[PDB]
Amino acid sequence: RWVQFMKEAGQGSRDMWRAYSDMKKANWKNSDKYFHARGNYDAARRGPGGAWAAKVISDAREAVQKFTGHDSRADQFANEWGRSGKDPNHFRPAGLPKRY
Amino acid sequence: RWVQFMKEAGQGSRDMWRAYSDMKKANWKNSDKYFHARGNYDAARRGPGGAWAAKVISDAREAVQKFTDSRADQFANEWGRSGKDPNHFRPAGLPKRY
Amino acid sequence: RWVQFMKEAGQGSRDMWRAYSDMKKANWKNSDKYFHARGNYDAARRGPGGAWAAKVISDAREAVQKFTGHGDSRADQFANEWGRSGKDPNHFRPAGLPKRY
Ligand SMILES: CC1=C(/C=C/C(C)=C/C=C/C(C)=C/CO)C(C)(C)CCC1
């Protein structure tokens, strides 16, 4: 039912949060696009609910970015890259620890 | 904050539902696109969270439609959401409260 | 702490899934308002993250009702809010509902 979709959305949201926290924790220059792609990739592979959550969260982030001044297209490109099932590692900065 | 964002989202959502409510309350001559634009326009006026909310609701609506046209609604949605005037789609003599 | 909020939200989500699951198993007449109320009650008790998760889930449910048929919604939301505010879910308990629920 809609329950299963929502559970996937819930999982997808956590994948999104996981990507965000791992990115602060890593504090690695030019890592953002990797984590954006990775969070959307992980989330979408939870199923339709996860892919929906990743999009909704990504657009919420874009909206806040716009409001505060900037970039955004590049981020959304990385977002959609991972969400479509493409490898986030194409954005992986050299030396990024294997645990991320 | 994101408390502020979420507030705007709540308000924007209400503007949306209120748009959809009004529309049923008016079984109309070709009234669709006006209500869709107005909801988004109202919702976007609340701020970023409202614009964001209007978009998730619009896209969701469209998604459910995809088992039952959709693009023309989406044009009207983005019209209002961008701030362009919803009355552009007003039908012939639509009651004043809408 | 975002971590704590996220932890409460996860718990509250589980409380919500547990209510819906319990509702299904029980298959008891006139019982949805109880489970709607109970899920929000248990969720809100987790902390702000839980109350928030329960609202997001309740509002998403209402949204899907409206797009399709399920639409009554106001009555469901009244129960949701009732439980989420901390009021007794048993206010909606139908006669005979097994005690474990
Ligand atoms: C009020 C409001 C919401 C309602 C969302 C909807 C409409 C959820 C249903 C989605 C479905 C079924 C999508 C199918 O692709 C939530 C709380 C989520 C966030 C802010 C806007």
* DSSP letter string, A77-99: HHHHHHHTT--GGGG--TT--TT
Q: Dihedral sign, CA of A67, A76, B51, B3?
A: negative
Among residues C40, C49, C22, C43, the alpha carbon closest in space to that of C76 is found at C40
Mutate to test the interface with A, among C8, C17, C23, C55 (most CBs of A within 10 A): C17
Contact between residue B57 and residue B9 where contact means Cβ atoms under 8 Å apart: no
A35 to chain C, minimum CA–CA distance in Å? 18
Residues 6+ positions from C61 with CB-CB distance below 8 Å:
A2, C76
Take atom 1 of ligand 1 and give the residue whose Cα is closest.
B13
A60 to chain C, minimum CA–CA distance in Å? 15
Q: SS3 for C68?
A: coil
Take atom 2 of ligand 1 and give the residue whose Cα is closest.
B13
C-alpha to C-alpha distances, B53 to A22, B8, B41, nearest whole angstrom: 27, 8, 12
Contact between residue B18 and residue B58 where contact means Cβ atoms under 8 Å apart: no
Domain range for A92 is 1-100
Q: Which amino acid is at A17?
A: W
Contact between residue C15 and residue C54 where contact means Cβ atoms under 8 Å apart: yes
Give the Cα separation of C35 and C23 in Å (integer): 6
Quote the ligand 1 centre to A52 CA distance (angstroms).
Answer: 10
Quote the ligand 1 centre to C37 CA distance (angstroms).
Answer: 20
Q: Which atom of ligand 1 is nearest to the CA of B57?
A: 7
* Resolution in angstrom units: 2.2
C-alpha to C-alpha distances, A26 to A16, A17, A58, nearest whole angstrom: 15, 14, 20
Q: Which atom of ligand 1 is nearest to the CA of B9?
A: 20
Contact between residue C50 and residue C15 where contact means Cβ atoms under 8 Å apart: yes
3-class secondary structure for chain B?
CHHHHHHHHHHHHHHHHHHHHHHHCCCCCCCHHHHHHHHHHHHHHCCHHHHHHHHHHHHHHHHHHCCCCHHHHHHHHHHHHCCCCHHHHCCCCCCCCC
Residues with CB under 6 A from ligand 1: A 52; B 9, 13, 53, 56-57, 60, 63; C 56, 59-60, 63-64
Q: Which amino acid is at A40?
A: N
Contact between residue A22 and residue A36 where contact means Cβ atoms under 8 Å apart: no
- The experimental method behind these coordinates is X-ray
Tokens (6 digits) for C12: 């509250």
| Chain C residues inside the 8 Å CB shell of B11 | none
Structural domain total, chain A: 1
Give the Cα separation of C82 and B63 in Å (integer): 31
Q: Which amino acid is at C53?
A: A
Q: Is there a contact between A14 and C6 if contact means CB atoms under 8 Å apart?
A: yes
